[PDB]
Amino acid sequence: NLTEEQIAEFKEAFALFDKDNSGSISASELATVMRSLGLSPSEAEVADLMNEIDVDGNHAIEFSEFLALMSRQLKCNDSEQELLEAFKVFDKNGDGLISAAELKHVLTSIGEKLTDAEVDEMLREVSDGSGEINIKQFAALLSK
Template identity: 30%
Template sequence: MSAVISTDDLHRIFRNLDTDNNGLVTVQELQHFLHRVGIQTTLEDLKKLVGRASLDYIDFVFFYEAMTESRIAEQVDGDHKDDLLKAFKVFDLNGDGFISCEELQSMLSKMGLWDKQNGKDCRDMIDVYDKNSDGVLDFEEFKNMMSAPAPADQTS
């Protein structure tokens, strides 16, 4: 799977996870975030995976990149569709088989990726991948969205 989270988004997620503003995200904070977005893992497994008690921003980016690379390896092994289906179910909050604008916005908010002041409408994001123009994303459309390359970071 191609990376779908920009550097700006990763930095925003890190800042949201760093609840005490000390420049570090603990394994516990990371686990809490993963659980909020529907990824269940034990603290012990996460500690083994991370290899330390906390991550600074650079370590956090390396952790994300390692997870992204492992997803690419899983795609080669044929597990990619199962992972995408699990992710789809996390976003499909009401279980109707579609991701609505409200569901997408809710999950992006939980992940710290929804900035209410930026003026963007999640409908615009859905419209890019909504091939049948029904206003929601089905699994195939979601799969296309998640497989798309991340937009280039905009620098001022």
């Protein structure tokens, strides 16, 4: 599934968690990196992650388990690029937001004649009080 280069690249990332170069990621290494990035995992969350990811049962994430953790991201790279391209179809001015005027232009392109009021309402249903739709909301919308 993975090339020699893909393995190498993940190994470098893995090595950044592994502060003492022991060949695995401890609960303290995991908690430290996550906290330094502002993710504030609780102890119960860290304990759960070690249990779920290190199926070897040593409370130390090995490289093979790190790869299995990240493999879905590789499987999903094409979908992520498509999502961004689809968002760009709406977002003509490229400011990372979809407005009602941009939604209207797509609607017209595909032969859907809606009043401006209906376009406003269409956008409002999925915007969160906002006048525009951002990439997060675009993705959330497609999560059913």
